[PDB]
Each structure stands twice: as structure tokens, then as C-alpha cells.
Design a protein around this ligand. Structure first.
Ligand SMILES: CNc1nccc(-c2cccnc2Oc2ccc(Nc3nc4ccc(C(F)(F)F)cc4[nH]3)c3ccccc23)n1
Length: 300
């Protein structure tokens, strides 16, 4: 622990506060707030999201945000993990942590907005389906999250709150894993129980294999175009009993048979019998390739 104590390469990370144009609020937490900004010369102009420590923060709050900064630095860069771009740590203003802005926001809300703009696959004339989501998009998002999680695992990380609300969508259909820190809201019971593996619910065990369970729930979210898990079910002791017994969600409205089986696999009762993220990357990549290449219309 005590990640805040890690060496800080200021030449790499430090960004001048006066090179930010602060814009609309994006969200608030115990730390302070996250606001949209345009940053000049952070890499040109680039839109970013800036998490800033509130004035009058406690030592523990301040330590927590610095720890977060150091954790993001330690993990390192991956396409599918929200990209840390800079920080403002020196005297003269608040502690600020700067990440890339993702135009389309969280994946759950985005997918929900596209329910009248989805077709399994385009057919010519394709302009009838301009900016529509397809199965190819959904498998692509799934593959990317698996890639991100594979990367996090290789960094010896465990996410602990994997869910569609914690995935951000940028341009060029690139998705990014984040942690909005909502554990520290209707998705959280005073714990994100709907996303938690049975060993996590009953025994507070968190491993990369419980993240795999959560990934299964995330897949269900994707292939339902942003529905809330376990429709029509109160999340109480009977829910937990039935989960232990082997009851699982039914196939969502937009799934393929293969994708549903993958959900079921992720939801194995035994952590060791669930696929690894490496296996998921392989499997999903193969499913994506098949999907992306199967229509030979334009390939005479
Ligand atoms: C609407 N578009 C958009 N684009 C980018 C960011 C946001 C955003 C909006 C409201 C609140 N937070 C937002 O972004 C963040 C998410 C998570 C953050 N923190 C975070 N801390 C993390 C630590 C670890 C990992 C792991 F990679 F392991 F998954 C991911 C983590 N994510 C942010 C930190 C600083 C600034 C923004 C952060 N919103």
C-alpha cells in the first residue's frame, strides 16, 4: 500500500494549471469533482477530464487522490484503460489528475441510447444504417474490455467493480476501462451485488477470477444494449440462494448463441473453472474476426 509515496516523474507528468480551460462539470465524488477541460500542449488542443481535490479536504482524502494518481502511473498505458495524460501537483492550486476525455461517456447509457439504431449487420445500401450499432460493434467492445482486463491482470491488478457503467466510449469505437469509485446509487446496495461473484458476496473474496464473473455480467449488459442486470428480481437473500444453486440470467435480446455461452462460462460457480481473460481475448477475438469477415459482399 501507500502508493502515494512512489517516485513522481514531474518532467513526464506535471502539467501547468494555466494551460487548462475549465468547462462543464462531469461528476462529483467524496474527493471533489471531475470537470471537462481543454488542455493546450498536454501531449495542440485536447479535451480532457480533470479530477480535482476539493478545498478543505482531509489528509486521508488528499492521500487517496495522490494514491490514485500513482496507481494510474504504476499500471501504465493501454488502449483499453482510461489514459492518464497529466497531473497538477505543485503549489499554487488544487491537486488535479487529468485523463483523456471519452466523447460518448459510459457504455451502459450509450448502448441504451442506441436501441432504435441497431441492426445485427448492415446490408447494402448501408446508408440506411448510418451510425448504427451492429453485432460486430458489440463483440468488438467485448473483445476490447477483455484485452484491457488481460492487461490489468498482467500488471497484477484486480478491478473489483467491473460493469458497463465503468466502461467509457471514445471515438473510433475504442472503449476504456475505468473506476468511477462509486463503491467508495441504485447499482450499489448499502456493494455492486448484481456484478459480484458468489464467493465475493458471501466471503468478500476478490480475485481476477471474480472479475471474470463481473465480465460475464458486463457481457449481458452489452448484449441487452444497456439493460440493468436481473430484471424483475429483488437483490436479497433469495437472489443469493438461487445464484449459489446455479440460477443465471436468461439470454439478452441482442445476443448470439456463442456470446450467451460465454456469459454462462464466466458465471461458473467454481472460480478456477471460469475462463481466464487471456482465454476470453482469444475466444472473443476469434468470434470478432468471424463476424467482421463473413460477409463477402464487398470482396469479389
Ligand atoms: C463523459 N466522458 C468522460 N470521459 C472521460 C472521463 C469522464 C469522467 C466523468 C466523470 C467522472 N470521472 C470521469 O473519468 C474518470 C474515471 C475514473 C477515474 N479514475 C480511475 N482510477 C483508476 C484506477 C485504476 C483503474 C484500472 F485501470 F485499474 F481499472 C482505473 C481507474 N480510473 C478518473 C480519474 C481522473 C479523472 C477522471 C476519471 N467522462
Amino acid at each position: 500500500e501507500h502508493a502515494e509515496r512512489l517516485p513522481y516523474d514531474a518532467s513526464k507528468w506535471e502539467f501547468p494549471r494555466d494551460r487548462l480551460k475549465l468547462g462543464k462539470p462531469l461528476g462529483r465524488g467524496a474527493f471533489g469533482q471531475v470537470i471537462e477541460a481543454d488542455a493546450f500542449g498536454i501531449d495542440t488542443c485536447r479535451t480532457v477530464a480533470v479530477k480535482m481535490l476539493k478545498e478543505g479536504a482531509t489528509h486521508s482524502e488528499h492521500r487517496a487522490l495522490m494514491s490514485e494518481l500513482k496507481i494510474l502511473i504504476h499500471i501504465g498505458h493501454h488502449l483499453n484503460v482510461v489514459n492518464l495524460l497529466g497531473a497538477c501537483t505543485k503549489p499554487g492550486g488544487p491537486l488535479m489528475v487529468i485523463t483523456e476525455f471519452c466523447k460518448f461517456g459510459n457504455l451502459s447509457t450509450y448502448l441504451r441510447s442506441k436501441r432504435n439504431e441497431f441492426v445485427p449487420y448492415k446490408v447494402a445500401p448501408e446508408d440506411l444504417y448510418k451510425d448504427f450499432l451492429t453485432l460486430e460493434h458489440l463483440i468488438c467492445y467485448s473483445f476490447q474490455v477483455a484485452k484491457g482486463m488481460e492487461f490489468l491482470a498482467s500488471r497484477k491488478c484486480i478491478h473489483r467493480d467491473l460493469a458497463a457503467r465503468n466502461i467509457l466510449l471514445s471515438e473510433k469505437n475504442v472503449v476504456k476501462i475505468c473506476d468511477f469509485g462509486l463503491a467508495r446509487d441504485p447499482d450499489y446496495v448499502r456493494l455492486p451485488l448484481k456484478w459480484m461473484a458468489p464467493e465475493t458476496i458471501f466471503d468478500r473474496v476478490y480475485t481476477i477470477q471474480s472479475d471474470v464473473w463481473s465480465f460475464g455480467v458486463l457481457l449481458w449488459e452489452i448484449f441487452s444494449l444497456g439493460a440493468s442486470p436481473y430484471p424483475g428480481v429483488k437483490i436479497d437473500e433469495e437472489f443469493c440462494r438461487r445464484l449459489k444453486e446455479g440460477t443465471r440470467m436468461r439470454a439478452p435480446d441482442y445476443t448470439t448463441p456463442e456470446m450467451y455461452q460465454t456469459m454462462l462460462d464466466c458465471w461458473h460457480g467454481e472460480p478456477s473453472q471460469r475462463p481466464t481473460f487471456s482465454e476470453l481475448v482469444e475466444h472473443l477475438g476469434n468470434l470478432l474476426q468471424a463476424n467482421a469477415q463473413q460477409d463477402r459482399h464487398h470482396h469479389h
